[PDB]
């Protein structure tokens, strides 16, 4: 994973998400969502999705939150007050915790202003406590900005480490972006069945055709302008989209 | 300015578990930037290092006195205070509380020097 | 391991200049730059005067002063007055296990 002080940002983009498999891993020990509900996140579509990766203590995942404070909201991470996505989270004891000590995650324990939400900041210069100037060496009110958690295997939970994964659905004014995928049902032909081609809404019987689309038209229609054939994504197969009977 | 107080005295027997309690006055615990120890020196002999507690709770202990001593904080009195098991003969000292300023390690621990200001120290002594 | 304060007692006229040695084992004690020098009066807590390997805190004498050497390390006066006897002990961070050691104290006497 990514330390905290410097998190990880990948940007996801035009895809098929699937929240489901995240929602019901039951691998996850935090799965909060704050815009949006968890289960109506497989129907809707957005942007971008952001996704932020570090590695805390495991009593710190509560400042990872719209409105918290604390040495890792303060300076080391911070989410916006109107946040919208979802934030992840589960025990790693075994993977980031080494015998003597594992001494390769840090964190930012002193900073002159909290941070802007989203904000990033991976400076190293000597902070300065007192009002003497520190000429960038250590001493008395001038100490070094950054800190290690030394894990350590046999530590009492709240003290483990946690994997943390927080995504970000953002919706700048784009005309589109990834969303959600669809699911699909058998074809019964012959049956005033309600149907649904990918967009195309309808009712009637399906029959099978004896027409012959071009090999890049989707759904014929008549005269009047009413749709009469399609074509089924699948196996692609011409059938005719007769009304249904009524009289 | 900062100052440094001991308690939790009295002619401990042997073979108990004494406790000594250091409270700060002038600056919070819970703050990072120092890490409050402990140091003993017996009666008319040179000085030796016990132990240091940081306000996430992680501890060091000297090799020669560990599996014995634990060390542990209160952020609510803002004190910190050690317990030592199974008392000797030998631990009668006089026993001051002190911060150390502890700089910056990379990756293997962090090293501390010079200390600051020292407890008061109140003598501990260990007979029947 | 121990930093052996070089030597147990030590005399001194009052005026002129007194120094105080202070060796120990290797580079895990001499070359490093993290030594301390601490002033306990008969009956109280010690007192640093120079840390880092040679600072002055705020608010000493300026009588105080050390400096380093190899394996050894220096602590030097430059005028010696009658309230300046007490004991001298020396700090250092090693890498063994530990961390920190102490020294042995050496006495300073004002004969006269």
């Known amino acids: 994973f990514a330390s905290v002080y410097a998190w990880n940002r990948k940007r996801i983009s035009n895809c098929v998400a699937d929240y489901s498999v995240l929602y019901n891993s039951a691998s996850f020990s935090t799965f909060k969502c704050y815009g949006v509900s968890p289960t109506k996140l497989n129907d809707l579509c957005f942007t971008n999705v952001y996704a932020d990766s570090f590695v805390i203590r495991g009593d710190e995942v509560r400042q990872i939150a719209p409105g918290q404070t604390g040495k890792i909201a303060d300076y080391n991470y911070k989410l916006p007050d109107d946040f919208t996505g979802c934030v992840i989270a589960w025990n790693s004891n075994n993977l980031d915790s080494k015998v003597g000590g594992n001494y390769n995650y840090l964190y930012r324990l002193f900073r002159k202003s909290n941070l802007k939400p989203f904000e990033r900041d991976i400076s190293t210069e000597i902070y300065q406590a007192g009002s003497t100037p520190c000429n960038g060496v250590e001493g008395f009110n001038c100490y070094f900005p950054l800190q290690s958690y030394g894990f350590q295997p046999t530590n009492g939970v709240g003290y483990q480490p946690y994997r943390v994964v927080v995504l970000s659905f953002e919706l700048l004014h784009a005309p589109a972006t990834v969303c959600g995928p669809k699911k699909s049902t058998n074809l019964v032909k012959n049956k005033c069945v309600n149907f649904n081609f990918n967009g195309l809404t309808g009712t009637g019987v399906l029959t099978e055709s004896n027409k012959k689309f071009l090999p890049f038209q989707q759904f014929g229609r008549d005269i009047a302008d009413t749709t009469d054939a399609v074509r089924d994504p699948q196996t692609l197969e011409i059938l005719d989209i007769t009304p249904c009977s009524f009289g | 300015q900062v100052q440094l107080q001991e308690s939790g005295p009295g002619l401990v027997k042997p073979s108990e578990t004494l406790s000594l309690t250091c409270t700060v006055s002038?600056?919070?615990?819970?703050?990072?930037?120092?890490?409050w120890s402990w140091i003993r020196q017996p009666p008319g002999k040179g000085l030796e290092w016990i132990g240091y507690?940081?306000?996430?709770?992680?501890?060091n202990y000297n090799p020669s006195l560990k599996s014995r001593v634990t060390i542990s904080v209160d952020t609510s009195k803002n004190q910190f205070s050690l317990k030592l098991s199974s008392v000797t003969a030998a631990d009668t000292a006089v026993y001051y509380c002190?911060?150390?300023?502890?700089?910056?390690?990379?990756?293997?621990?962090?090293?501390?020097?010079?200390?600051?200001?020292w407890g008061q120290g109140t003598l501990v002594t260990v007979s029947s | 391991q121990s930093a052996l304060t070089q030597p147990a007692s030590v005399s001194g006229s009052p005026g002129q200049s007194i120094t105080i040695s202070c060796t120990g084992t290797?580079?895990?004690?001499?070359?490093?730059?993290?030594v301390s020098w601490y002033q306990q009066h008969p009956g109280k807590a010690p007192k640093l005067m120079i840390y880092?390997?040679?600072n002055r805190p705020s608010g000493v004498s300026n009588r105080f002063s050390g400096s380093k050497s190899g394996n050894t390390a220096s602590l030097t006066i430059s005028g010696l007055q009658a309230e300046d006897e007490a004991d001298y002990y020396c700090?250092?961070?090693?890498?063994?296990?530990?961390?920190?050691?102490f020294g042995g104290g050496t006495k300073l006497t004002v004969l006269g």
């Open positions: 880092d390997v040679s």
């Open positions: 290797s580079s895990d004690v001499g070359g490093y730059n993290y």
């Open positions: 002190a911060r150390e300023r502890c700089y910056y390690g990379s990756g293997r621990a962090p090293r501390c020097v010079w200390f600051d200001p």
């Open positions: 700090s250092s961070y090693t890498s063994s296990s530990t961390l920190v050691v």
């Open positions: 507690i940081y306000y996430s709770g992680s501890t």
């Open positions: 002038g600056d919070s615990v819970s703050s990072g930037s120092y890490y």
